[PDB]
Scaffold this active site. Structure first.
Site, PDB file in Angstrom:
ATOM      1  N   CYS A 292     -76.267  48.766  25.957  1.00  0.00           N
ATOM      2  CA  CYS A 292     -76.364  47.873  26.847  1.00  0.00           C
ATOM      3  C   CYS A 292     -77.563  48.163  27.625  1.00  0.00           C
ATOM      4  O   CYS A 292     -77.589  49.453  28.265  1.00  0.00           O
ATOM      5  CB  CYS A 292     -74.991  47.853  27.790  1.00  0.00           C
TER       6      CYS A 292
ATOM      7  N   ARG B  71     -77.345  48.608  32.177  1.00  0.00           N
ATOM      8  CA  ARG B  71     -76.760  49.797  32.602  1.00  0.00           C
ATOM      9  C   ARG B  71     -77.157  50.080  33.895  1.00  0.00           C
ATOM     10  O   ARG B  71     -76.266  50.968  34.672  1.00  0.00           O
ATOM     11  CB  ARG B  71     -76.541  50.787  31.686  1.00  0.00           C
TER      12      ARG B  71
ATOM     13  N   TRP C  83     -74.306  39.504  33.712  1.00  0.00           N
ATOM     14  CA  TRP C  83     -75.298  38.001  33.276  1.00  0.00           C
ATOM     15  C   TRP C  83     -76.081  38.025  32.158  1.00  0.00           C
ATOM     16  O   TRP C  83     -76.563  39.027  31.683  1.00  0.00           O
ATOM     17  CB  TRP C  83     -76.042  37.673  34.655  1.00  0.00           C
TER      18      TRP C  83
ATOM     19  N   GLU D  84     -81.001  36.402  24.919  1.00  0.00           N
ATOM     20  CA  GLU D  84     -79.600  36.242  24.348  1.00  0.00           C
ATOM     21  C   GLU D  84     -79.396  34.847  23.924  1.00  0.00           C
ATOM     22  O   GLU D  84     -78.994  34.564  22.863  1.00  0.00           O
ATOM     23  CB  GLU D  84     -78.390  36.860  25.145  1.00  0.00           C
TER      24      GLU D  84
HETATM   25  C1  HEM Z   1     -75.033  43.165  34.899  1.00  0.00           C
HETATM   26  C2  HEM Z   1     -75.691  42.304  33.848  1.00  0.00           C
HETATM   27  C3  HEM Z   1     -75.873  42.753  32.220  1.00  0.00           C
HETATM   28  C4  HEM Z   1     -76.825  42.718  31.648  1.00  0.00           C
HETATM   29  C5  HEM Z   1     -78.383  41.910  31.649  1.00  0.00           C
HETATM   30  C6  HEM Z   1     -76.392  43.207  30.134  1.00  0.00           C
HETATM   31  C7  HEM Z   1     -77.234  43.392  29.110  1.00  0.00           C
HETATM   32  C8  HEM Z   1     -76.626  43.152  27.805  1.00  0.00           C
HETATM   33  C9  HEM Z   1     -77.291  42.868  26.414  1.00  0.00           C
HETATM   34  C10 HEM Z   1     -78.417  41.813  26.497  1.00  0.00           C
HETATM   35  C11 HEM Z   1     -76.477  43.172  25.666  1.00  0.00           C
HETATM   36  C12 HEM Z   1     -76.890  42.903  24.222  1.00  0.00           C
HETATM   37  C13 HEM Z   1     -75.811  41.599  23.801  1.00  0.00           C
HETATM   38  C14 HEM Z   1     -75.925  41.153  22.522  1.00  0.00           C
HETATM   39  O1  HEM Z   1     -77.040  41.275  21.572  1.00  0.00           O
HETATM   40  O2  HEM Z   1     -74.807  40.295  22.111  1.00  0.00           O
HETATM   41  C15 HEM Z   1     -75.474  44.082  26.050  1.00  0.00           C
HETATM   42  C16 HEM Z   1     -74.641  44.684  25.458  1.00  0.00           C
HETATM   43  C17 HEM Z   1     -73.538  45.489  26.047  1.00  0.00           C
HETATM   44  N1  HEM Z   1     -73.307  45.265  27.159  1.00  0.00           N
HETATM   45 FE1  HEM Z   1     -74.334  44.582  29.055  1.00  0.00          FE
HETATM   46  N2  HEM Z   1     -75.315  43.879  30.362  1.00  0.00           N
HETATM   47  C18 HEM Z   1     -74.662  43.509  31.677  1.00  0.00           C
HETATM   48  C19 HEM Z   1     -73.566  43.907  32.251  1.00  0.00           C
HETATM   49  C20 HEM Z   1     -72.515  44.562  31.425  1.00  0.00           C
HETATM   50  C21 HEM Z   1     -71.223  45.176  31.886  1.00  0.00           C
HETATM   51  C22 HEM Z   1     -70.549  44.561  33.085  1.00  0.00           C
HETATM   52  C23 HEM Z   1     -70.530  45.632  30.975  1.00  0.00           C
HETATM   53  C24 HEM Z   1     -69.246  46.162  30.773  1.00  0.00           C
HETATM   54  C25 HEM Z   1     -68.616  46.648  32.013  1.00  0.00           C
HETATM   55  C26 HEM Z   1     -71.628  45.828  29.730  1.00  0.00           C
HETATM   56  C27 HEM Z   1     -71.496  46.472  28.466  1.00  0.00           C
HETATM   57  C28 HEM Z   1     -71.864  46.206  27.314  1.00  0.00           C
HETATM   58  C29 HEM Z   1     -71.392  46.382  25.853  1.00  0.00           C
HETATM   59  C30 HEM Z   1     -70.104  47.147  25.695  1.00  0.00           C
HETATM   60  C31 HEM Z   1     -72.386  45.891  25.078  1.00  0.00           C
HETATM   61  C32 HEM Z   1     -72.497  46.075  23.447  1.00  0.00           C
HETATM   62  C33 HEM Z   1     -71.586  44.828  22.959  1.00  0.00           C
HETATM   63  C34 HEM Z   1     -71.363  44.858  21.567  1.00  0.00           C
HETATM   64  O3  HEM Z   1     -71.578  46.071  21.071  1.00  0.00           O
HETATM   65  O4  HEM Z   1     -71.276  43.745  20.887  1.00  0.00           O
HETATM   66  N3  HEM Z   1     -72.659  44.835  30.087  1.00  0.00           N
HETATM   67  N4  HEM Z   1     -75.650  44.017  27.415  1.00  0.00           N
HETATM   68  C1  LIG Z   2     -70.243  40.809  28.632  1.00  0.00           C
HETATM   69  S1  LIG Z   2     -70.789  42.084  28.105  1.00  0.00           S
HETATM   70  C2  LIG Z   2     -72.632  42.030  28.742  1.00  0.00           C
HETATM   71  C3  LIG Z   2     -72.695  41.319  29.872  1.00  0.00           C
HETATM   72  C4  LIG Z   2     -73.061  40.103  29.472  1.00  0.00           C
HETATM   73  C5  LIG Z   2     -74.314  39.900  28.694  1.00  0.00           C
HETATM   74  N1  LIG Z   2     -75.446  40.098  29.165  1.00  0.00           N
HETATM   75  N2  LIG Z   2     -74.200  39.969  27.420  1.00  0.00           N
HETATM   76  C6  LIG Z   2     -73.000  39.972  26.653  1.00  0.00           C
HETATM   77  C7  LIG Z   2     -73.116  39.472  25.200  1.00  0.00           C
HETATM   78  C8  LIG Z   2     -73.460  37.987  25.043  1.00  0.00           C
HETATM   79  C9  LIG Z   2     -73.849  37.201  24.104  1.00  0.00           C
HETATM   80  N3  LIG Z   2     -75.093  38.278  23.496  1.00  0.00           N
HETATM   81  C10 LIG Z   2     -74.328  35.867  24.057  1.00  0.00           C
HETATM   82  O1  LIG Z   2     -75.477  35.503  23.841  1.00  0.00           O
HETATM   83  O2  LIG Z   2     -73.464  35.137  24.581  1.00  0.00           O
END
Ligand code: HEM
Ligand SMILES: CSCCCC(=N)NCCC[C@H](N)C(=O)O
Ligand code: HEM
Ligand SMILES: C[C@H](O)[C@H](O)[C@H]1CNc2nc(N)[nH]c(=O)c2N1
Ligand SMILES: C[C@H](O)[C@H](O)[C@H]1CNc2nc(N)[nH]c(=O)c2N1
Ligand SMILES: CSCCCC(=N)NCCC[C@H](N)C(=O)O
Ligand SMILES: [Zn+2]
Lengths: 407, 411
Positions: free
Chosen positions: B108, B111, B280, B285
């Site tokens: 992520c 973070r 968000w 994405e």
């Molecule tokens: C605040 C705005 C956030 C942004 C910009 C963000 C950004 C991203 C992005 C771009 C990815 C890659 C997603 C993909 O390729 O599908 C990701 C993965 C991930 N994010 Fe974040 N995130 C945010 C909030 C969060 C929150 C609130 C959580 C959990 C509380 C979280 C947990 C994770 C996890 C667990 C993954 C890996 C998901 C997977 O393995 O498929 N993210 N995040």
């Molecule tokens: C909900 S966990 C991360 C916070 C939202 C986010 N930024 N990405 C999550 C995966 C979204 C997916 N890659 C899509 O293009 O719909």
């Protein structure tokens, strides 16, 4: 112990068995992945020699034949009495082609078996090396129609008598620190450029000064030599629609030739083994031109395209990156110098992976290096699971020789 | 043992001691790296050490390690485990727990926001209808009329693994995919399997290119039930381009709230199998992956035609050219409609600072380079140039199998 890799764009699933003959170590543990780190005796020599000839004789379908066992006795005999040994020509050619075959960071490996090998083991002097090198440069350049080649200098002995090409590539541009703070030329080479002058080079102090070769034969101090200009094929960089592009006065060389790696065949170490292929466009256009610690021209280019640099969200760096790379590929093509774009290079590598799965049981591959540094997920390698492991023979990194060499 | 990571752009070397506190295996061995592989009932016996480890982390973070309040909580958890075979987290522990799972999420790039996470505790929920209500409030709170706020909702933990709460959706808001008889797909091909399931469960599909899926919710191990999210709660953005006026005519839109709903949240050994969370979007994405993957909306060809690019030779980079314009359009559309979004330059830059801060203050930041680096323009963002160490800390978000593959149907 048998492993699956899946392509997520095509659902194709491949089974790797080839990793079971993996020898060296990755840098990873069950606790920690290092997949993104750039750098992660008579008794030792025999197992190595054995494992290698076993590979060789099995490949020519003479495994466990009289000739197999015989050569194996012969090499032990030599080990026992010389403490090293010498490869036959056929083994040297096989060893080198296989080292390219096993280079997990190399996207260009569909070509692996067409390598032209030049056996320079009879070389004794830097003048000798310089001759071998120019002959390599000319043969591979081939007036633009580039051909794969490697030139192999004598193997190490006591490590006091090593052959080394000090340049990191045969053909690269100088780097000069300047009065104002900044850097003229190529920042990657700044230190080697100091060493050239410190060894005696008269530097012309421009933006694109082809470095001299710095060659070390048999453990001696290294010597300076200037590659005949007529042998350095260079491309001026223009754009098929942007008129003003040529006024940046960018050019690049046509022959990428990595010259600082070490070749390991059956426990033998060849510390000078320059090799060359040809460029994928992104190498110059994305990395050499656009890395901050390289030529770093994105700012100026976007300035000429009158894009809105007022905030990252207009994607101006991205718009420029594209046009810069359009201008590398077009320039090379217009001058008929072999070049491959990242789209067809990656598609070829997918084809190569499939072939290798089918005929060899796998294909070691380092995803971090195979995926190009622009437009990643629109190349098929992005969606391809890869396994990375270290097979032998191989190309290895080795420390820059000035850190080691004693005068 | 200390570990060094170098940034090859800036020459900053950082020292990771944090990987010492690591539990779960990576998939890799000394003989093989699986760093690119996408996916490489619990006894009383094995529960208390996990509980204990977590509570030690917890009490340390609030500076009361070894306090009487710390010792008593250990003993009280121990006693509850022995007596009931599981245990309940206090509210404060759950909050701390969900925050850490995010902080530990190595894939992520967002973070830097980890500490500002709204946790909604839905552990009193008993039914699917109860779930729909919690989810609706999550969607409305996190949407906040376009000024998005990160949030997670936590349903009751697993007990005997026969009473699981699950959200069958992989995101709370996602679009239908429909396989036609001619082999083409209408809508999002990522969601065809789940779309079939919905129809089979009694959903009346509109069958257009952007039909928001209904929620499919399982409470207490019961068969799941359908619910339509109120359309007024679904913020959507039509996509247009700041210079290309025909771009609106592709008919593209996207939803503003990404909310992953299929992951499992693990804390102190307890398993929360339904914990939808949202933040968000980073622009790539949608603009790179959702629109341009061959297996998603696959619009590159259509956008390139409309741009009249030279498509005869891939060496025109017509694909690269179209891709940038699409990402521009996604960013432009979101910013114009005042819906939070972030570009990949700004996001990766933020992540770099987050990462360096994490080293100074925590002694590390596990990161998965393969995922952290954006899927366009990788090397012009500073993460490409950043060495990363990937390892598994708890609390964590884990993958779990799709529930239609595991669920025992009641009838
Ligand atoms: C605040 C705005 C956030 C942004 C910009 C963000 C950004 C991203 C992005 C771009 C990815 C890659 C997603 C993909 O390729 O599908 C990701 C993965 C991930 N994010 Fe974040 N995130 C945010 C909030 C969060 C929150 C609130 C959580 C959990 C509380 C979280 C947990 C994770 C996890 C667990 C993954 C890996 C998901 C997977 O393995 O498929 N993210 N995040
Ligand atoms: C909900 S966990 C991360 C916070 C939202 C986010 N930024 N990405 C999550 C995966 C979204 C997916 N890659 C899509 O293009 O719909
Ligand atoms: C024939 C056309 C070739 C193409 C298109 C090609 C392509 C590439 C590319 C794009 C890289 C990454 C380079 C970088 O990012 O710095 C690479 C790395 C590498 N290639 Fe190939 N290559 C070719 C031929 C060869 C040959 C002939 C050899 C050896 C005989 C070779 C061995 C390697 C090795 C060892 C690496 C990793 C080098 C390192 O770690 O810096 N390549 N190649
Ligand atoms: C930190 C990271 O390992 C480093 O930037 C790598 C990433 N991928 C790469 N890929 C290629 N082909 N060449 C490179 O030099 C690098 N650099
Ligand atoms: C095989 C490979 O790991 C797979 O394509 C990964 C690569 N990197 C990724 N990176 C992100 N952020 N999201 C993804 O879905 C993927 N897919
Ligand atoms: C030289 S052997 C590998 C095949 C040649 C090549 N295509 N590039 C490799 C290194 C060149 C470096 N990326 C550059 O941009 O100069
Ligand atoms: Zn690994």
């Amino acid at each position: 112990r048998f492993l699956k890799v899946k392509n997520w764009e095509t659902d194709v699933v491949l089974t790797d068995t080839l990793h079971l003959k993996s020898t060296l170590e990755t840098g990873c543990t069950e606790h920690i992945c290092m997949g993104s780190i750039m750098l992660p005796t008579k008794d030792q020599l025999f197992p190595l020699a054995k494992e290698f000839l076993d590979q060789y004789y099995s490949s020519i379908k003479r495994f466990g034949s009289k000739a197999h066992m015989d050569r194996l006795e012969e090499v032990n005999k030599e080990i026992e009495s010389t403490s090293t040994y010498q490869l036959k020509d056929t083994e040297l050619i096989y060893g080198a082609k296989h080292a390219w075959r096993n280079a997990s960071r190399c996207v260009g490996r569909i070509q692996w078996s067409k390598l032209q090998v030049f056996d320079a083991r009879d070389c004794t002097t830097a003048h000798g090396m310089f001759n071998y090198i120019c002959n390599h440069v000319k043969y591979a350049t081939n007036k633009g129609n580039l051909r794969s080649a490697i030139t192999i200098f004598p193997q190490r002995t006591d490590g006091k008598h090593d052959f080394r090409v000090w340049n990191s590539q045969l053909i690269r541009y100088a780097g000069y620190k300047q009065p104002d703070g900044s850097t003229l030329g190529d920042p990657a080479n700044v230190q080697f450029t100091e060493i050239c002058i410190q060894q005696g080079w008269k530097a012309p102090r421009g933006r694109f000064d082809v470095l001299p070769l710095l060659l070390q034969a048999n453990g001696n101090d290294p010597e300076l030599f200037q590659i005949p200009p007529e042998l350095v094929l260079e491309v001026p960089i223009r754009h098929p629609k942007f008129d003003w592009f040529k006024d940046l006065g960018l050019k690049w060389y046509g022959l990428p030739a990595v010259s600082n790696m070490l070749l390991e065949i059956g426990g033998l170490e060849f510390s000078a083994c320059p090799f060359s292929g040809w460029y994928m466009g992104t190498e110059i256009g994305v990395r050499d031109y656009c890395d901050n610690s390289r030529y770093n021209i994105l700012e100026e280019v976007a300035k000429k395209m009158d894009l809105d640099m007022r905030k990252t969200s207009s994607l101006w760096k991205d718009q420029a990156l594209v046009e810069i790379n359009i201008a590398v590929l077009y320039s090379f093509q217009s001058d008929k110098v072999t070049i491959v774009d990242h789209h067809s290079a990656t598609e070829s590598f997918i084809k190569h992976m499939e072939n290798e799965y089918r005929c060899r049981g796998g294909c070691p591959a380092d995803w971090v290096w195979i995926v190009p540094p622009m437009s990643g997920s629109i190349t098929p390698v992005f969606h391809q699971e890869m396994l990375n492991y270290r097979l032998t023979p191989s190309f290895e990194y080795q420390p820059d020789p000035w850190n080691t060499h004693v005068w």
